[PDB]
Subunit: 295 residues, 6 copies
């Protein structure tokens, strides 16, 4: 927790960042959000993949049509201010754009607007389990949009797992194929080859997942994106999840069945290092993923 | 609007019913809610199917394991208190149980509690359109729960129709069979028979829908809950929707194709007469659907 | 073959009933048609279920929106004229409403019209087989509409069967459940109970199928409409198909597996008799299904 | 229009190319057909991908076992004869093989033959809409065949869009993934990459689509045939359709949501320049796509 | 154990009923079996719905075309002889029909034969879990047949449950609706109304399930065979399984959610009573369901 | 036949490898097996991709959790010993792993054990038919495992074919795309390009299929593992199956439609040659696929 939360343009003390109980988002799910990290690097404070997280913010809203007045540049400025103002060096940043107090109609009224908030606060395998709950089918609720009411599904998958002793629930899609974990993407390593499910497998265009396939590429790793069947979890040699909060989580077991040697992940280790190496200097920011706060 | 919103037990001045910005339900759509109508009748104010609505508030949370402190009777008294203290007669009541300012993780920290809030405020066919979006598939995000997050889907089906000049969009399930309108059930009359999709067609078990089947049975109309094909909409003699806020709306054209002779639903008529005769005294409340405020 | 074919209002000799090679129907499938019988009865010439066949004609067009100028009464008059003029007593009548010479655009041009034709000409089990071709999925091509391009599917199912020695191909739907034969409905008799698939099983609202469930009812037979699984063909006690051309066809084998005693059909026999009994006088036209030509 | 339609070998005065009204293709949609463009080029008249189109005429009939007397070269000569005898330069050619006046049963009487007829006549983005109808499912009515009956589906997807003010409706397959427009393929550009659904998404293997992939490869653009989710349409940088009659049409908005900056597709541009440069001589015909009439 | 297993028509000491290791069934899962109970009654030893279990043995083989020398009556007498011969009063009878030492080719040689055995040996709620595995889809492996290859599904659903602490795994079909538990049918109770999945939900046509439906009809309960959703499990008042070896087991928590008051089962109890009273003499065996070994 | 079947670590005269009739596997289909070939080579007796077949034996059991005492190497040596001991040069080796005389309960008691056997005995196109049965759906019965319960599917597809005159039945998945034939993988050839269904099409990860992909890559052919449609079968230039006992069989007509010229198979032939040349010495065994019995 901290002080100050950027909110509709201005910095507000943590405690006065309040909203009415009749805001649309609280009843209908109508908000859209992001997860961004800020690492202290060899040059950092640096936020990892800023522009790309804010452009996703804008895209989630585009799908739903929540009018948004800030620009990606305005929004990135803001996020840097929140960090700086709060005197944070390594934090989890959280932008949210939600339909505020507007009526109680599902279809908000014309020329209405969203209120936008940006808060920040300081920041072997694990045994996953396959869940009985499937992820969202296709043309039903946009899995590409990172919208707030999507997380009901992440709640179902996640709790079920925790409730039984695991640390993660991997969900299948309505087709019976692997989609992803409760709230983060799933990678398998077979014979030294990469492999993740495509988005049509109701997976979400993770930005970490993205950085990974790229590093995998610099690292000389073939990467195949394709539909994975349940069984593959039992036959893979490595399995690991990715996400802004998690980064790279080795999964050493799935349904109790050991995933090769009980976590060791030679490929995983290589990728991990490529990853952290970025904040250390060992890895070249070929692409331009670090955006210092203190510029 | 009104003044006074029952919030966790106390009545609060409406302008003061605020919630912090980091409340779980805003970000992750975790909240559950209901819609209840208060009608003025031949004796009313009379809350319609008050108990069924409150039980359903409880079923919906049971399904997501959200912890509710209040019993069903506490909730009912509080709804009646809310009506009175605002000096209301005919209103719309909105009870909302939601995960509050528990932390920022999807699985709320065990032993947390919800916040309940009850708010009340005063309160031919129509040309529907079949929508391009589909309702949630079966074992993904439970459609039998009136939950927050589900609403992204009523928004998608709902704006689309408005956007093209219709007054309601009817959604299909992932199998291509009729589900229900954006936020309300759908019925059709064929050779004087009733017909409405099963919950298995991704239809919410509606409290109004339930009332209509009962009345129908008393009016001696045969009723068939059965899966329906998109084309029946164009071949039916009558079609109409029902919901707590829309009672029974007849539909005169679907996709521009006139549902049998541009409205005058004889059966829709009789059912509209039975339903309203409840509040008039013409229809004998045999199930005990009306619950006065001042008792 | 005969002389005279009603065509757009007038009677034309069989040989001059011609149309341009660039009529829309020949290239795009855009026609809609019916099959009606005319039996010589104890009072007949009588056409069986006239109005209901012409109303279906009108409904197929309604789904597709092929403007039609004739009325059901105009069209029935016509059909009686064609019969009478041709001096037919027992015939197969064939109305067709197709998009004529209009352009080569799939979406015919505004205020265009259809040309309508009405021609007539004189009019154990069988071993069916289950086909590898599935029937049309749901919201793809209206199985309720009896449109001309639908018959590609009937061609696939039918030829496959004939090509292998059977007399009929029963098709499953995309779900793996029984839908119907190539061009006629499928009934199973289990323990003295009826059973046919509903339309949502991509079956077509056969008018014979309709008369059957009715007679079944007068006859004291319970009738259940529901989703049948493949296996049921092997476990049923009776199986039989229906259609305007076929009437009631006992199926004594399916995939070589005998369907109870190699056709005997006690229930089938009862229904059959109820059916023919109609033209004989033995059965009462409770419903009003005979429409004499010579009135 | 023109005068002279090649009909079963002879050239006939256009007004005389008539077919009896009881021809099979009118009632049962049994006919197969193609669309070929004749362009005037830096040497043209030049029939574009003439052989591929005629081979496809043959593939489509092979699939339904319609017997074709003419070889591929007979058909080509006849198409060139048709162009010449009508003194055409730039035209649209329509070859149609169809079941003629064989009897009235769905399975045409063995040893029957088709009738072929070849006719020729002279010849920002656009705002598409995602349709409420779905394209044919996999093993129902073969979508790899350009057949008559399939067209009921292009009509349904096509009028709907027109009916609501769009210039094209994009259809989804029964799985909720993008199939293709009403009668033409769909492509998207993302980070400068190409992407187009597989035939398995119920997409017809288009001859123009094929040309575009080839040119694209020569322009050095990466191409990915992969299943696509409805939402990619709103997130893509460019989107455009292709068909023999519509070449390459860019799409500027889908569902009212602007596809990246309301048209100017850089890549669509380059591909439009390569494709047209064929007829100009700027693009070297390496595959041999142009086939002169006068040779 | 016991001694004397019937075997191809002869009784054989238990230790001599051996079969070669290259018997079809051990490699390819080509056996078909039954589960039958002998009950000590108010007149028993009495075999429960003996013939119906033998008819189904026949049906299971008829579908896979396995040949059967023995009539139902011979199988029945042999069943009795095995009971008497072993001096049993209450046991679990197990008849198998399997493909023997025939070749290593999946299609047994023509005119082969199945070996037959008949072994018989002496014979609050539970807490089910919804399984992460699904049951056979429709036209894949006939589910109306108790083939032994099937039990790989039961093996996976049941061990998942056991491994996690539960005592029964309930499985969903491919559609996501409820099917049945690992080895038994599933009934739900709502407002004193019955409810169970039909076969098309990939439910074996249980013989107990049927007994129960028949009883309930006598008790005057209404029954609804209708498709069911996962969530209905957490909202019913009572849920219970049935099968030859579990008779009528009550479930009291599903996924750790109480089925309306940690068991109390009112309708469940009326049923069990009526069930067991058939053995006691209290329930009239109106149907003829009890066959005494000693006749 | 032969004499000496390995068995739980001992060699046993062929007639003494017997197993009790109440062994799990005969009732419940709980065995797991492999198909291996011993080839007389330019240096053989040589076992083809021996270890990979033994690893897969392990994998099949790992998925069903069947316990295994023997290492891969012990299974390998035992394989060799059975070859030598029987004085064989070319045979078909069959290793089984099955659940023995454990109880009649679907879940074997804890700490139980699987019995292991290893029998070995001496060891134009075809005309396939598309089957009316489909293959296991995705998360129902793991298809990446060669369990024996599975072969009920192979049993149904293959006998359908044989019964109708064909010699192989090709099966579709539940989606309607192509899966594989009764017992072997299916490859198609188009414009000198390879093509086969991925596993998610419910295709067993064949060991021949893999060999073939590897060869073709050496021959410089391009390969595409991609989902395939039924109709692609009638349009490819060459189609062929593969499996341990069929090596590489060419199909020349599918459903009675010639696969481009009643076999001539150019790419098919380059493959077979490269295949067989591994045994002759012509093809370099770059991978190490041949294990000599005598080491
Ligand atoms: C947020 C999210 C992820 C993680 O995405 P990153 O953008 O890589 O931080 C993965 N799956 C779901 C469901 C998510 O919403
Ligand atoms: C609330 C709701 C209905 C209608 O409910 P009633 O209880 O009849 O008020 C229908 N569909 C959806 C999605 C709903 O939320
Ligand atoms: C025409 C038709 C039938 C038969 O209908 P009747 O109207 O009973 O004559 C059945 N199935 C299909 C596919 C048909 O088009
Ligand atoms: C003909 C057609 C196309 C486009 O074909 P081209 O060969 O590129 O002309 C696309 N979709 C459908 C349904 C078509 O018929
Ligand atoms: C054996 C079986 C049952 C129970 O059937 P009963 O005749 O009633 O004992 C139920 N489900 C499955 C999968 C079974 O095979
Ligand atoms: C055994 C099997 C194959 C063939 O596998 P190979 O290792 O290549 O012999 C293919 N399909 C099925 C269903 C099989 O089980």
């Amino acid at each position: 927790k901290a002080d100050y939360i950027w909110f509709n343009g201005e910095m507000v003390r943590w405690e006065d960042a309040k909203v009415h109980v009749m805001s649309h988002a609280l009843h209908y799910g109508t908000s859209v959000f992001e997860g961004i990290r800020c690492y202290d690097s060899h040059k950092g404070p640096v936020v990892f993949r800023h522009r790309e997280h804010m452009q996703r913010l804008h895209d989630s809203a585009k799908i739903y049509r929540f009018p948004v007045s800030q620009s990606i540049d305005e929004l990135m400025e803001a996020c840097r201010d929140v960090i700086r103002k709060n005197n944070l060096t390594s934090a989890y940043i959280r932008p949210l754009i939600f339909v505020g107090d507007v009526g109680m109609g599902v279809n908000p009224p014309a020329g209405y607007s969203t209120d936008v908030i940006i808060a920040a606060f300081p920041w072997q395998g694990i045994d996953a389990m396959v869940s009985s709950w499937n992820r969202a089918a296709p043309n039903t609720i946009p899995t590409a949009a990172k919208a707030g009411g999507n997380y009901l599904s992440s709640l179902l998958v996640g709790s079920e797992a925790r409730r039984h002793g695991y640390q993660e629930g991997i969900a299948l899609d309505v087709n019976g194929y692997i989609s992803e974990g409760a709230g983060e993407n799933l990678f398998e390593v077979k014979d030294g080859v990469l492999f993740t499910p495509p988005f049509t497998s109701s997976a979400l265009p993770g930005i970490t997942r993205d950085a990974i396939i790229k590093l995998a590429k610099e690292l000389g790793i073939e990467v195949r994106e394709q539909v994975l069947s349940r069984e593959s979890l039992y036959l893979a040699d490595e399995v690991f999840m990715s996400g802004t909060a998690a980064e790279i989580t080795p999964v050493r077991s799935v349904d109790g069945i050991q995933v090769g040697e009980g976590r060791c992940g030679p490929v995983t280790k290589r990728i991990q290092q490529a990853f952290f190496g970025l904040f250390t200097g060992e890895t070249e920011d070929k692409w331009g993923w670090l955006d210092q706060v203190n510029q």
